[PDB]
Amino acid sequence: NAMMYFISDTHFYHENIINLNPEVRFKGFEIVILTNLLKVLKPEDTLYHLGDFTWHFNDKNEYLRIWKALPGRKILVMGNHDKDKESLKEYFDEIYDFYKIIEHKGKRILLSHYPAKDPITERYPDRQEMVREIYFKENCDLLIHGHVHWNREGCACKDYRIECINANVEWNDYKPISEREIDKLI
């Protein structure tokens, strides 16, 4: 039945990221991402995008129109590059500006774009602290986030009694994460 998927940091149209993360990003990554979502989503599913959706809204290659066409419910948890909520409103059914809490088969899940701690560079320490704060305050069991890109080594959201999983495309071979992998923890 209804499955939950999580993906983030798609950077649709961020052509330059091919240069910035030569390692993982390659020309035509939008098509690859959209493809992997295509062969998985069903009308009753729900896809969570945890940040940095599109680089701009000039849908010259149909990437956005295609995304819009995909089946299932789509909700977004805003990342630092996600600024125009009005432009976004028609690519998502629900938009949460910072976090969203959901409960799955008992356990409580915090959805945010920011991690508890960036294992590399803590560019947004204040936002990281808020995530931790919420996590603790709401007695959350897991944190699903994005923001931290692929690197040649390996979240820091472990130095705190916090469990997490990085939904960033660069870490999951441009595939959404199923609610299955969540259960692999529970």
JSON list of C-alpha atoms in Angstrom, two decimals:
[
{"chain": "A", "resi": 1, "resn": "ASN", "atom": "CA", "xyz": [0.00, 0.00, 0.00]},
{"chain": "A", "resi": 2, "resn": "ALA", "atom": "CA", "xyz": [0.83, 3.67, 0.56]},
{"chain": "A", "resi": 3, "resn": "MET", "atom": "CA", "xyz": [4.61, 4.05, 0.87]},
{"chain": "A", "resi": 4, "resn": "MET", "atom": "CA", "xyz": [6.63, 7.04, 2.10]},
{"chain": "A", "resi": 5, "resn": "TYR", "atom": "CA", "xyz": [9.73, 8.16, 0.18]},
{"chain": "A", "resi": 6, "resn": "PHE", "atom": "CA", "xyz": [12.42, 10.67, 1.06]},
{"chain": "A", "resi": 7, "resn": "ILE", "atom": "CA", "xyz": [14.83, 12.53, -1.17]},
{"chain": "A", "resi": 8, "resn": "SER", "atom": "CA", "xyz": [16.61, 15.86, -1.00]},
{"chain": "A", "resi": 9, "resn": "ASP", "atom": "CA", "xyz": [19.17, 18.21, -2.51]},
{"chain": "A", "resi": 10, "resn": "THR", "atom": "CA", "xyz": [18.03, 17.49, -6.05]},
{"chain": "A", "resi": 11, "resn": "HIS", "atom": "CA", "xyz": [19.41, 20.83, -7.25]},
{"chain": "A", "resi": 12, "resn": "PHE", "atom": "CA", "xyz": [17.38, 20.63, -10.45]},
{"chain": "A", "resi": 13, "resn": "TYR", "atom": "CA", "xyz": [18.96, 22.93, -13.02]},
{"chain": "A", "resi": 14, "resn": "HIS", "atom": "CA", "xyz": [22.01, 23.61, -10.87]},
{"chain": "A", "resi": 15, "resn": "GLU", "atom": "CA", "xyz": [24.26, 22.90, -13.85]},
{"chain": "A", "resi": 16, "resn": "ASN", "atom": "CA", "xyz": [27.33, 24.14, -11.96]},
{"chain": "A", "resi": 17, "resn": "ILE", "atom": "CA", "xyz": [27.09, 21.47, -9.29]},
{"chain": "A", "resi": 18, "resn": "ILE", "atom": "CA", "xyz": [28.53, 19.11, -11.92]},
{"chain": "A", "resi": 19, "resn": "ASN", "atom": "CA", "xyz": [31.65, 21.22, -11.52]},
{"chain": "A", "resi": 20, "resn": "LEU", "atom": "CA", "xyz": [31.36, 21.61, -7.74]},
{"chain": "A", "resi": 21, "resn": "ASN", "atom": "CA", "xyz": [30.92, 17.88, -7.05]},
{"chain": "A", "resi": 22, "resn": "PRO", "atom": "CA", "xyz": [32.68, 16.42, -10.12]},
{"chain": "A", "resi": 23, "resn": "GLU", "atom": "CA", "xyz": [32.94, 13.28, -8.08]},
{"chain": "A", "resi": 24, "resn": "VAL", "atom": "CA", "xyz": [29.21, 12.52, -7.93]},
{"chain": "A", "resi": 25, "resn": "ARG", "atom": "CA", "xyz": [27.35, 15.01, -10.13]},
{"chain": "A", "resi": 26, "resn": "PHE", "atom": "CA", "xyz": [27.29, 14.46, -13.89]},
{"chain": "A", "resi": 27, "resn": "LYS", "atom": "CA", "xyz": [25.46, 15.93, -16.86]},
{"chain": "A", "resi": 28, "resn": "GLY", "atom": "CA", "xyz": [21.88, 14.67, -17.07]},
{"chain": "A", "resi": 29, "resn": "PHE", "atom": "CA", "xyz": [21.40, 13.99, -13.36]},
{"chain": "A", "resi": 30, "resn": "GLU", "atom": "CA", "xyz": [17.94, 15.55, -13.38]},
{"chain": "A", "resi": 31, "resn": "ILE", "atom": "CA", "xyz": [16.75, 12.86, -15.78]},
{"chain": "A", "resi": 32, "resn": "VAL", "atom": "CA", "xyz": [18.29, 10.16, -13.62]},
{"chain": "A", "resi": 33, "resn": "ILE", "atom": "CA", "xyz": [16.61, 11.43, -10.46]},
{"chain": "A", "resi": 34, "resn": "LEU", "atom": "CA", "xyz": [13.23, 11.86, -12.16]},
{"chain": "A", "resi": 35, "resn": "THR", "atom": "CA", "xyz": [13.61, 8.39, -13.63]},
{"chain": "A", "resi": 36, "resn": "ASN", "atom": "CA", "xyz": [14.23, 6.71, -10.27]},
{"chain": "A", "resi": 37, "resn": "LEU", "atom": "CA", "xyz": [11.18, 8.45, -8.86]},
{"chain": "A", "resi": 38, "resn": "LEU", "atom": "CA", "xyz": [9.15, 7.48, -11.88]},
{"chain": "A", "resi": 39, "resn": "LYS", "atom": "CA", "xyz": [9.62, 3.77, -11.36]},
{"chain": "A", "resi": 40, "resn": "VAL", "atom": "CA", "xyz": [8.56, 3.66, -7.75]},
{"chain": "A", "resi": 41, "resn": "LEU", "atom": "CA", "xyz": [5.92, 6.27, -6.91]},
{"chain": "A", "resi": 42, "resn": "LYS", "atom": "CA", "xyz": [2.31, 5.19, -6.99]},
{"chain": "A", "resi": 43, "resn": "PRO", "atom": "CA", "xyz": [-0.79, 7.38, -6.63]},
{"chain": "A", "resi": 44, "resn": "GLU", "atom": "CA", "xyz": [-1.22, 6.59, -2.92]},
{"chain": "A", "resi": 45, "resn": "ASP", "atom": "CA", "xyz": [2.43, 7.12, -1.97]},
{"chain": "A", "resi": 46, "resn": "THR", "atom": "CA", "xyz": [3.88, 10.27, -0.41]},
{"chain": "A", "resi": 47, "resn": "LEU", "atom": "CA", "xyz": [7.25, 11.79, -1.29]},
{"chain": "A", "resi": 48, "resn": "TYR", "atom": "CA", "xyz": [9.12, 14.02, 1.14]},
{"chain": "A", "resi": 49, "resn": "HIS", "atom": "CA", "xyz": [11.60, 16.49, -0.38]},
{"chain": "A", "resi": 50, "resn": "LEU", "atom": "CA", "xyz": [13.84, 17.71, 2.42]},
{"chain": "A", "resi": 51, "resn": "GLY", "atom": "CA", "xyz": [15.53, 20.72, 0.84]},
{"chain": "A", "resi": 52, "resn": "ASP", "atom": "CA", "xyz": [17.07, 22.52, -2.12]},
{"chain": "A", "resi": 53, "resn": "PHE", "atom": "CA", "xyz": [14.55, 21.45, -4.73]},
{"chain": "A", "resi": 54, "resn": "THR", "atom": "CA", "xyz": [15.28, 23.54, -7.81]},
{"chain": "A", "resi": 55, "resn": "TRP", "atom": "CA", "xyz": [18.01, 26.02, -8.70]},
{"chain": "A", "resi": 56, "resn": "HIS", "atom": "CA", "xyz": [15.60, 28.28, -10.61]},
{"chain": "A", "resi": 57, "resn": "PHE", "atom": "CA", "xyz": [12.12, 28.08, -12.11]},
{"chain": "A", "resi": 58, "resn": "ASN", "atom": "CA", "xyz": [12.87, 28.40, -15.79]},
{"chain": "A", "resi": 59, "resn": "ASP", "atom": "CA", "xyz": [11.68, 24.88, -16.64]},
{"chain": "A", "resi": 60, "resn": "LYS", "atom": "CA", "xyz": [13.30, 24.91, -20.10]},
{"chain": "A", "resi": 61, "resn": "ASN", "atom": "CA", "xyz": [13.91, 21.13, -20.12]},
{"chain": "A", "resi": 62, "resn": "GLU", "atom": "CA", "xyz": [10.55, 20.08, -18.62]},
{"chain": "A", "resi": 63, "resn": "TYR", "atom": "CA", "xyz": [12.22, 18.80, -15.49]},
{"chain": "A", "resi": 64, "resn": "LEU", "atom": "CA", "xyz": [9.71, 20.62, -13.29]},
{"chain": "A", "resi": 65, "resn": "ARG", "atom": "CA", "xyz": [6.68, 19.86, -15.45]},
{"chain": "A", "resi": 66, "resn": "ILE", "atom": "CA", "xyz": [7.75, 16.21, -15.29]},
{"chain": "A", "resi": 67, "resn": "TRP", "atom": "CA", "xyz": [8.18, 16.33, -11.52]},
{"chain": "A", "resi": 68, "resn": "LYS", "atom": "CA", "xyz": [4.71, 17.85, -11.22]},
{"chain": "A", "resi": 69, "resn": "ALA", "atom": "CA", "xyz": [3.29, 15.01, -13.33]},
{"chain": "A", "resi": 70, "resn": "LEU", "atom": "CA", "xyz": [4.70, 12.30, -11.05]},
{"chain": "A", "resi": 71, "resn": "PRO", "atom": "CA", "xyz": [2.12, 10.37, -9.02]},
{"chain": "A", "resi": 72, "resn": "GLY", "atom": "CA", "xyz": [1.69, 10.48, -5.24]},
{"chain": "A", "resi": 73, "resn": "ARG", "atom": "CA", "xyz": [1.46, 13.30, -2.69]},
{"chain": "A", "resi": 74, "resn": "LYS", "atom": "CA", "xyz": [4.43, 15.68, -2.52]},
{"chain": "A", "resi": 75, "resn": "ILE", "atom": "CA", "xyz": [5.44, 17.74, 0.49]},
{"chain": "A", "resi": 76, "resn": "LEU", "atom": "CA", "xyz": [8.54, 19.91, 0.95]},
{"chain": "A", "resi": 77, "resn": "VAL", "atom": "CA", "xyz": [10.69, 20.85, 3.94]},
{"chain": "A", "resi": 78, "resn": "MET", "atom": "CA", "xyz": [12.56, 23.98, 2.89]},
{"chain": "A", "resi": 79, "resn": "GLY", "atom": "CA", "xyz": [16.32, 24.10, 2.54]},
{"chain": "A", "resi": 80, "resn": "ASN", "atom": "CA", "xyz": [18.52, 27.19, 2.41]},
{"chain": "A", "resi": 81, "resn": "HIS", "atom": "CA", "xyz": [18.22, 27.64, -1.34]},
{"chain": "A", "resi": 82, "resn": "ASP", "atom": "CA", "xyz": [14.42, 27.18, -1.34]},
{"chain": "A", "resi": 83, "resn": "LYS", "atom": "CA", "xyz": [13.30, 30.83, -1.12]},
{"chain": "A", "resi": 84, "resn": "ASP", "atom": "CA", "xyz": [10.17, 31.51, -3.19]},
{"chain": "A", "resi": 85, "resn": "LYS", "atom": "CA", "xyz": [7.27, 29.72, -1.52]},
{"chain": "A", "resi": 86, "resn": "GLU", "atom": "CA", "xyz": [4.79, 30.99, -4.13]},
{"chain": "A", "resi": 87, "resn": "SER", "atom": "CA", "xyz": [6.70, 29.52, -7.05]},
{"chain": "A", "resi": 88, "resn": "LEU", "atom": "CA", "xyz": [7.02, 26.29, -5.10]},
{"chain": "A", "resi": 89, "resn": "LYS", "atom": "CA", "xyz": [3.38, 25.97, -4.10]},
{"chain": "A", "resi": 90, "resn": "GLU", "atom": "CA", "xyz": [2.55, 24.27, -7.35]},
{"chain": "A", "resi": 91, "resn": "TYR", "atom": "CA", "xyz": [5.20, 21.59, -7.20]},
{"chain": "A", "resi": 92, "resn": "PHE", "atom": "CA", "xyz": [4.18, 20.47, -3.71]},
{"chain": "A", "resi": 93, "resn": "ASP", "atom": "CA", "xyz": [0.92, 19.89, -1.82]},
{"chain": "A", "resi": 94, "resn": "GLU", "atom": "CA", "xyz": [2.36, 20.83, 1.56]},
{"chain": "A", "resi": 95, "resn": "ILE", "atom": "CA", "xyz": [5.34, 23.03, 2.40]},
{"chain": "A", "resi": 96, "resn": "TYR", "atom": "CA", "xyz": [6.92, 23.28, 5.84]},
{"chain": "A", "resi": 97, "resn": "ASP", "atom": "CA", "xyz": [9.45, 26.07, 6.24]},
{"chain": "A", "resi": 98, "resn": "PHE", "atom": "CA", "xyz": [11.75, 24.27, 8.66]},
{"chain": "A", "resi": 99, "resn": "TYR", "atom": "CA", "xyz": [10.71, 20.83, 9.90]},
{"chain": "A", "resi": 100, "resn": "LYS", "atom": "CA", "xyz": [7.92, 18.29, 10.03]},
{"chain": "A", "resi": 101, "resn": "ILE", "atom": "CA", "xyz": [7.27, 15.53, 12.48]},
{"chain": "A", "resi": 102, "resn": "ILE", "atom": "CA", "xyz": [5.69, 12.25, 11.46]},
{"chain": "A", "resi": 103, "resn": "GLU", "atom": "CA", "xyz": [5.07, 8.94, 13.25]},
{"chain": "A", "resi": 104, "resn": "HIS", "atom": "CA", "xyz": [5.72, 5.64, 11.54]},
{"chain": "A", "resi": 105, "resn": "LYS", "atom": "CA", "xyz": [4.82, 2.23, 13.00]},
{"chain": "A", "resi": 106, "resn": "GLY", "atom": "CA", "xyz": [5.25, 3.59, 16.50]},
{"chain": "A", "resi": 107, "resn": "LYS", "atom": "CA", "xyz": [8.52, 5.51, 16.21]},
{"chain": "A", "resi": 108, "resn": "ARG", "atom": "CA", "xyz": [8.58, 9.30, 15.86]},
{"chain": "A", "resi": 109, "resn": "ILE", "atom": "CA", "xyz": [10.40, 10.91, 12.92]},
{"chain": "A", "resi": 110, "resn": "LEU", "atom": "CA", "xyz": [11.85, 14.41, 12.57]},
{"chain": "A", "resi": 111, "resn": "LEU", "atom": "CA", "xyz": [12.10, 15.64, 9.00]},
{"chain": "A", "resi": 112, "resn": "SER", "atom": "CA", "xyz": [14.40, 18.57, 8.42]},
{"chain": "A", "resi": 113, "resn": "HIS", "atom": "CA", "xyz": [16.80, 19.76, 5.74]},
{"chain": "A", "resi": 114, "resn": "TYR", "atom": "CA", "xyz": [19.57, 20.40, 8.23]},
{"chain": "A", "resi": 115, "resn": "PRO", "atom": "CA", "xyz": [21.50, 17.69, 10.11]},
{"chain": "A", "resi": 116, "resn": "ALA", "atom": "CA", "xyz": [22.25, 17.56, 13.82]},
{"chain": "A", "resi": 117, "resn": "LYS", "atom": "CA", "xyz": [25.88, 18.26, 12.91]},
{"chain": "A", "resi": 118, "resn": "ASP", "atom": "CA", "xyz": [27.64, 18.67, 9.56]},
{"chain": "A", "resi": 119, "resn": "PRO", "atom": "CA", "xyz": [30.49, 16.11, 9.50]},
{"chain": "A", "resi": 120, "resn": "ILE", "atom": "CA", "xyz": [32.44, 18.48, 7.30]},
{"chain": "A", "resi": 121, "resn": "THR", "atom": "CA", "xyz": [31.53, 22.14, 7.43]},
{"chain": "A", "resi": 122, "resn": "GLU", "atom": "CA", "xyz": [28.95, 23.56, 9.81]},
{"chain": "A", "resi": 123, "resn": "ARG", "atom": "CA", "xyz": [27.68, 26.40, 7.65]},
{"chain": "A", "resi": 124, "resn": "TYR", "atom": "CA", "xyz": [24.41, 26.80, 9.51]},
{"chain": "A", "resi": 125, "resn": "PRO", "atom": "CA", "xyz": [25.20, 26.06, 13.19]},
{"chain": "A", "resi": 126, "resn": "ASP", "atom": "CA", "xyz": [22.07, 27.90, 14.43]},
{"chain": "A", "resi": 127, "resn": "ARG", "atom": "CA", "xyz": [19.78, 25.80, 12.26]},
{"chain": "A", "resi": 128, "resn": "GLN", "atom": "CA", "xyz": [21.59, 22.60, 13.23]},
{"chain": "A", "resi": 129, "resn": "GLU", "atom": "CA", "xyz": [20.99, 23.49, 16.88]},
{"chain": "A", "resi": 130, "resn": "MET", "atom": "CA", "xyz": [17.28, 24.02, 16.27]},
{"chain": "A", "resi": 131, "resn": "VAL", "atom": "CA", "xyz": [16.98, 20.55, 14.74]},
{"chain": "A", "resi": 132, "resn": "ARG", "atom": "CA", "xyz": [18.67, 18.98, 17.76]},
{"chain": "A", "resi": 133, "resn": "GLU", "atom": "CA", "xyz": [16.48, 21.06, 20.06]},
{"chain": "A", "resi": 134, "resn": "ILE", "atom": "CA", "xyz": [13.28, 19.90, 18.36]},
{"chain": "A", "resi": 135, "resn": "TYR", "atom": "CA", "xyz": [14.54, 16.33, 18.26]},
{"chain": "A", "resi": 136, "resn": "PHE", "atom": "CA", "xyz": [15.09, 16.35, 22.03]},
{"chain": "A", "resi": 137, "resn": "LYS", "atom": "CA", "xyz": [12.00, 18.37, 22.94]},
{"chain": "A", "resi": 138, "resn": "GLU", "atom": "CA", "xyz": [9.68, 16.07, 20.98]},
{"chain": "A", "resi": 139, "resn": "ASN", "atom": "CA", "xyz": [11.51, 12.90, 22.03]},
{"chain": "A", "resi": 140, "resn": "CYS", "atom": "CA", "xyz": [12.13, 11.87, 18.44]},
{"chain": "A", "resi": 141, "resn": "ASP", "atom": "CA", "xyz": [13.44, 8.46, 17.47]},
{"chain": "A", "resi": 142, "resn": "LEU", "atom": "CA", "xyz": [14.91, 9.34, 14.09]},
{"chain": "A", "resi": 143, "resn": "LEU", "atom": "CA", "xyz": [15.97, 12.31, 12.00]},
{"chain": "A", "resi": 144, "resn": "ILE", "atom": "CA", "xyz": [15.81, 12.14, 8.23]},
{"chain": "A", "resi": 145, "resn": "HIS", "atom": "CA", "xyz": [17.64, 15.06, 6.64]},
{"chain": "A", "resi": 146, "resn": "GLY", "atom": "CA", "xyz": [19.68, 16.21, 3.66]},
{"chain": "A", "resi": 147, "resn": "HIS", "atom": "CA", "xyz": [22.04, 19.14, 3.21]},
{"chain": "A", "resi": 148, "resn": "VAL", "atom": "CA", "xyz": [25.32, 17.16, 3.59]},
{"chain": "A", "resi": 149, "resn": "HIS", "atom": "CA", "xyz": [26.77, 16.28, 0.18]},
{"chain": "A", "resi": 150, "resn": "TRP", "atom": "CA", "xyz": [28.84, 13.34, -0.88]},
{"chain": "A", "resi": 151, "resn": "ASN", "atom": "CA", "xyz": [32.50, 13.38, 0.11]},
{"chain": "A", "resi": 152, "resn": "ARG", "atom": "CA", "xyz": [35.21, 10.78, -0.43]},
{"chain": "A", "resi": 153, "resn": "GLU", "atom": "CA", "xyz": [35.02, 9.60, 3.21]},
{"chain": "A", "resi": 154, "resn": "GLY", "atom": "CA", "xyz": [31.64, 9.50, 4.98]},
{"chain": "A", "resi": 155, "resn": "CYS", "atom": "CA", "xyz": [26.63, 12.50, 9.06]},
{"chain": "A", "resi": 156, "resn": "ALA", "atom": "CA", "xyz": [27.91, 13.83, 12.37]},
{"chain": "A", "resi": 157, "resn": "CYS", "atom": "CA", "xyz": [24.38, 13.39, 13.68]},
{"chain": "A", "resi": 158, "resn": "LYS", "atom": "CA", "xyz": [25.82, 10.60, 15.80]},
{"chain": "A", "resi": 159, "resn": "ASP", "atom": "CA", "xyz": [27.99, 12.61, 18.21]},
{"chain": "A", "resi": 160, "resn": "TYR", "atom": "CA", "xyz": [24.70, 13.47, 19.89]},
{"chain": "A", "resi": 161, "resn": "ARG", "atom": "CA", "xyz": [22.35, 10.74, 21.05]},
{"chain": "A", "resi": 162, "resn": "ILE", "atom": "CA", "xyz": [20.63, 11.21, 17.69]},
{"chain": "A", "resi": 163, "resn": "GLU", "atom": "CA", "xyz": [19.93, 8.62, 15.00]},
{"chain": "A", "resi": 164, "resn": "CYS", "atom": "CA", "xyz": [19.69, 9.80, 11.40]},
{"chain": "A", "resi": 165, "resn": "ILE", "atom": "CA", "xyz": [19.76, 9.05, 7.69]},
{"chain": "A", "resi": 166, "resn": "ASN", "atom": "CA", "xyz": [20.87, 11.35, 4.87]},
{"chain": "A", "resi": 167, "resn": "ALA", "atom": "CA", "xyz": [18.22, 11.61, 2.12]},
{"chain": "A", "resi": 168, "resn": "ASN", "atom": "CA", "xyz": [20.54, 13.63, -0.17]},
{"chain": "A", "resi": 169, "resn": "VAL", "atom": "CA", "xyz": [20.59, 12.18, -3.70]},
{"chain": "A", "resi": 170, "resn": "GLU", "atom": "CA", "xyz": [24.39, 12.22, -3.80]},
{"chain": "A", "resi": 171, "resn": "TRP", "atom": "CA", "xyz": [24.51, 9.60, -1.03]},
{"chain": "A", "resi": 172, "resn": "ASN", "atom": "CA", "xyz": [21.82, 7.29, -2.33]},
{"chain": "A", "resi": 173, "resn": "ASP", "atom": "CA", "xyz": [22.71, 7.08, -6.01]},
{"chain": "A", "resi": 174, "resn": "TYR", "atom": "CA", "xyz": [19.95, 9.56, -6.90]},
{"chain": "A", "resi": 175, "resn": "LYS", "atom": "CA", "xyz": [17.13, 7.37, -5.54]},
{"chain": "A", "resi": 176, "resn": "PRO", "atom": "CA", "xyz": [14.47, 8.25, -2.95]},
{"chain": "A", "resi": 177, "resn": "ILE", "atom": "CA", "xyz": [14.67, 6.34, 0.29]},
{"chain": "A", "resi": 178, "resn": "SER", "atom": "CA", "xyz": [11.78, 4.02, 1.01]},
{"chain": "A", "resi": 179, "resn": "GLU", "atom": "CA", "xyz": [9.98, 3.70, 4.32]},
{"chain": "A", "resi": 180, "resn": "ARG", "atom": "CA", "xyz": [11.58, 0.26, 4.18]},
{"chain": "A", "resi": 181, "resn": "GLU", "atom": "CA", "xyz": [15.03, 1.50, 5.11]},
{"chain": "A", "resi": 182, "resn": "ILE", "atom": "CA", "xyz": [13.42, 3.23, 8.10]},
{"chain": "A", "resi": 183, "resn": "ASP", "atom": "CA", "xyz": [12.11, -0.12, 9.30]},
{"chain": "A", "resi": 184, "resn": "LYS", "atom": "CA", "xyz": [15.56, -1.62, 8.90]},
{"chain": "A", "resi": 185, "resn": "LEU", "atom": "CA", "xyz": [16.24, 0.54, 11.96]},
{"chain": "A", "resi": 186, "resn": "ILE", "atom": "CA", "xyz": [13.03, 0.23, 14.02]}
]
